[PDB]
Amino acid sequence: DGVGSSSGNWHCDSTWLGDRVITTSTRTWALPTYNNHLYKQISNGTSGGATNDNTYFGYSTPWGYFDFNRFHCHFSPRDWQRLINNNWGFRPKRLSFKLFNIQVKEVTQNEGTKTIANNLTSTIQVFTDSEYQLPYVLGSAHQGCLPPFPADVFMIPQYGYLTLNNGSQAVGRSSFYCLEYFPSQMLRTGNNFQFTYTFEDVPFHSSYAHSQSLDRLMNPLIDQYLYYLSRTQTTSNGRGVTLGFSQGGPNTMANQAKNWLPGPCYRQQRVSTYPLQNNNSNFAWTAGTKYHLNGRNSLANPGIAMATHKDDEERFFPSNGILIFGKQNAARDNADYSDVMLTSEEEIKTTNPVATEEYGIVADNGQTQTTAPQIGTVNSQGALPGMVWQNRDVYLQGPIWAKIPHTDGNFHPSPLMGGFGLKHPPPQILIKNTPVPADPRSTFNGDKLNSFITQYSTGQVSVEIEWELQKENSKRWNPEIQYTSNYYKSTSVDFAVNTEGVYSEPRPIGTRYLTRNL
Amino acid sequence: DGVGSSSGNWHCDSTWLGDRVITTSTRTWALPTYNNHLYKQISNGTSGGATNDNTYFGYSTPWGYFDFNRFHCHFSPRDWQRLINNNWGFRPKRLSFKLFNIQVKEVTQNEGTKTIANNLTSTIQVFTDSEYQLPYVLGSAHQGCLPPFPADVFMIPQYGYLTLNNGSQAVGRSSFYCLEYFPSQMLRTGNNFQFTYTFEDVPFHSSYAHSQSLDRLMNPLIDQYLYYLSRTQTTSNGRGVTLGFSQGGPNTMANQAKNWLPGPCYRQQRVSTYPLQNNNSNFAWTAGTKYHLNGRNSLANPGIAMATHKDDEERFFPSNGILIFGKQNAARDNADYSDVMLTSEEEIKTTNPVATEEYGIVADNGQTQTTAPQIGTVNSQGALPGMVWQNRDVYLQGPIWAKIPHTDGNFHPSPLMGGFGLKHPPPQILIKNTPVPADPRSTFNGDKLNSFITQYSTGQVSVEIEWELQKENSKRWNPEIQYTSNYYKSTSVDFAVNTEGVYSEPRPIGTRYLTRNL
Amino acid sequence: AHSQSLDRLMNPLIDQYLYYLSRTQTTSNGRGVTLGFSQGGPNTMANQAKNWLPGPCYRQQRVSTYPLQNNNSNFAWTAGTKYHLNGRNSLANPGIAMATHKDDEERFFPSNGILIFGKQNAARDNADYSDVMLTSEEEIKTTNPVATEEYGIVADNGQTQTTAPQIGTVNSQGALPGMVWQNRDVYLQGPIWAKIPHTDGNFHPSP
């Protein structure tokens, strides 16, 4: 394997075998030099216009990293359709990673002309953090993924991390990390890199909706043998005290005894899609739903999984309580409503409470002959025995996994942006250009060398994931709901390039179409 | 195999062994970057000056493809002569393909000076579509073949395809294809590519003419024992009704009973080579012979195989009903009659009807004593039991095969431009330069990379086809007609270069010289 | 369904090496006779040479779903598309497989040329249009001709200097070499099999 032989081939394919499917993707990347080969302290503090909520302390490194953690990395729109229409669930099993056909290039400036040449003896260096010894920066939903469309070339993002801070300052427990203090592999243009990984057992993502609601599980034809208190007061003659009792039945179903409870609630503020129906004020931050950690307020975004709206409320959404994707060429700041794509969790109404409404009612007081009953409203409810709930849905544009924090305890460790929680997630992959010094002085100086040759590198990357499928077995007589493409004529095809060669994704696509009994 | 060793050799040869011949060709190619590495939506619609007949919707890719589908790719004029003079038929058997001695080159502009350098670490990528999963664009008689003359260097054509349209717009069933979504092989300058293919059983092309005509198959010396109706009216005395009957014989041969029928007819409009004999008007489109598909009119070019003209009519040809080749350096649009070469199907008069004339006559009405017989003219005739016909001839400049459309049914699936119809034709071969990014910015941006280094590639291509021959076995006493070269002196040699180094082909050469009994 | 149409199989980016007759008459100066020739290309695609032909045609009469657009008369039987067997006329129902309508014609259907299912509790005789369910074969436009339109145009005569060209319209077309076609679709309410008649010969024995 010299300079004249390729170290790998292009693999983009999908294979559907029985109970599993295997996806494989190849992309072309470009890796710049970051920071001028330097580590740098970064911070932000309230001395400037920053509020206390936004302060941080950390470091930016001279390293890049690979991110394949979105679904459109591994699935074409047609492959995603086969998955969601035919299956009740899926989970990842194992992956392979390859890095090959590396070429390092040097650029030099003379006056205004720029030239690029090959540097055949330069290296890049790569390693995986397989012992989870670095701050794990995947799972924060950052940009810099492998592109959804296989013909696009992408830039590799810069690695950095945060530590503890007090304001803009570091405390005694703050940690610093040098990535050169890790063994890594060095590659010239004829070398290549690969590794394999196995996922730990994780539950299947549930791709389906319930065809029953938690409060409707009864037989509509039969009475219950249990009684409830239907009457505290005599109707006949005057008004007087009595105890009446009735059995629950077809017309009283709201009164019947039940075995189960809806899932937990943390209430969100309601926002209409028609702006004229909203109050006139800027309440996005002040009315936002937050948590409070070490004197510092953080918006709970999206939060726990709750139904977006109830029946015929579709114009409302929770303020910070949903995932929002941008359309192609949308602005970074202050984008309009026509520029973004709002997801809906509406399928989970059958089980989870609605995000913008109360959980229920409890008794505020005890009552007497002289004191009337008082009722409270429950806007926040933690886990109660007998609750059942659904997780948030996953999307073709959305994240796949997250790393579960290493802690004494946790409760239902499913990521709140949606995905698979993992104690040992796929390891993060660090990549860097090796610095090449410019000619030094001819007399010894002990200071470090600050003058380098300008370089960048390009190459190929492949990733292959095996997925396990859960087949749908159902006696439903009538046809299902399916994801489909519009039949009518159009100026362009959805999920294709336009006249200018730009690939766009028209809408977000969820996973829940087939149904199952509750 | 490094940068200093060649990955293949030059093979151009022909070998005649018994019942088979093997041809092999080598050419030099050049592959540009197309579209700036982009896929692009293309369309045409009636909003502009385009009529509804010419509308389309589709995509152009950044890929090239190889086309060897003309006969002059595989045969020298002398080899074609050996074939057509000595054999009654031939068909293809198997082929081999090689791609070797690849070299990638980078071109950079500084002011007005241009320089070209080798880029030793760059790749090209190649694949064959062997599962027939792409729109099959061969068999449309496009330019971009391997040149007929082995010393010429050719440019590789750009790949593209069409989908369904309504006007300039796409409908719901329109498909988009990314060719990067196919596994492909990547080659640096020291690598090479090859594959083999086997043709499915196909009938021999018939290279011969019939020495008998379908209506002359009788013994000229003997009467038939069958009778026909020769007389409806009394000749003697006055005019009166009678039924006369006669046996068919040597002088009545037009009246004899026969077992067979001429092939099908779709009539063409007649055009004289002497312009003064044609009507004065532009009737090429308005008088053209067409079919009508989804509200959109398409000229039937050339159409079903019919004889070009009858005896002593040689000055006439069917309007859109023949193949027309251009001479060397002929114009693209509005070329003169001396610039083009008209083929003639005249050999099939013995069987197929003439293209510009009616099929026959049928009865229009039933007759009575008061009603005289009425006759209709048959200008279009589909398949009747007892028909026999010949296919259109093949030429040294013409196509070899076509892909048979995948459909519920078809009738006599022989391509109408002439050739071998194939359910699984030789697979199409896609080739592309791998994009090499220019130096990116030193701070991360998430947009795709639009800036590249300009490159192109060159190399060698070999193709080898084995052909099976059908030997001629004949008791004819007198000598045959043969294809020959003119004996008389000339300014240049036919099928050679001129003073300027330009190779030309003087005339089209068909396959049908030897004869056979009908 | 096919995602391509039989007349669009070409590469949109490239010219053909074959020529066609584009010009019978001189544009410049006066009107005079000449022979012009052009190569087929991206903008001329209707003129290009092709290898294949659409399937066979037996034309049907056209009926609009909006009754106000139909002629005023009872033409169902008299304008019906028939065959004639032993002196006895039989409506050809549904007939050979043809596309129900072309683009943006969806309001039209062939008279006896489609399958029609009734809704629940529909009348036996003289049911209304809201009582029945019309199928559509529209998916086969890419290959088969439309049921209510002509197959194509052929030459009626030979031409001379004194005689102008005449064109005929082809309303019925049998099998030609190079045709391809699709069968009629099957439905959840429809039949599964049929018995092929026992005969000396048949052509494409699909029910």
Author numbering:
A (entry chain M), B (entry chain A): 220 to 737
C (entry chain f): 428 to 634
Please quote the authors directly.
Adeno-associated viruses (AAVs) are helper-dependent parvoviruses that have become a leading gene therapy vector, with Food and Drug Administration approvals in the United States and a growing list of clinical trials under way. The AAV capsid is composed of 60 monomers of viral proteins (VPs) 1, 2, and 3, in a 1:1:10 ratio. The VP3 region forms the capsid surface, with a number of features common across AAVs. These include a pore at the 5-fold axis of symmetry, essential for DNA packaging during assembly and externalization of VP1/2 N-terminal domains during trafficking; depressions at the 2-fold axis and surrounding the 5-fold pore; and protrusions at the 3-fold axis, often used to engage cell attachment factors, including glycans and the AAV receptor (AAVR).
